[PDB]
Write a protein that binds this ligand. Structure first.
Ligand SMILES: [Cl-]
Ligand SMILES: [Cl-]
Length: 120
């Protein structure tokens, strides 16, 4: 199983981005999926997660009411709607799958997509 991300980029503060992630390869399960983020010299930190059936979500406090995680239509797809972005949201964002909770013990990881939020 491999994970591919899209939707990153450079955006002005107050703007919005929608990150997307999709599993490729034969998956034998519907997985829980998550997003983490990493700034230079620091660790990947939890942002949000959603269970396989879409019924349960978990969010870091710093993004509550601004970021919303959801499942996509295809099997093992997830989106992260990022609104009201701030410069501190600048990071590489990683999709993960196969796990639960806020630690980095998820079985599958994407290779990251850069988000940069700039004042304008
Ligand atoms: Cl890490
Ligand atoms: Cl899972």
């Amino acid at each position: 199983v491999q994970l591919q991300e899209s939707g990153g980029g450079l955006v002005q503060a107050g703007g919005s981005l929608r990150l997307s992630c999709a599993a490729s390869g034969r998956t034998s399960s519907v997985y829980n999926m998550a997003w983490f983020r990493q700034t230079p010299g620091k660790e990947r930190e939890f942002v949000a997660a959603i269970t396989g059936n879409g019924g349960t979500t978990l969010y870091a406090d710093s993004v509550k009411g601004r970021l919303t995680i959801s499942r996509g239509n295809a099997k093992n797809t997830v989106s992260l709607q990022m609104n009201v972005l701030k410069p501190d949201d600048t990071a590489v964002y990683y999709c993960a799958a196969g796990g639960w909770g806020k630690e980095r013990n998820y079985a599958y990881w994407g290779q990251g997509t850069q988000v940069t939020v700039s004042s304008h």
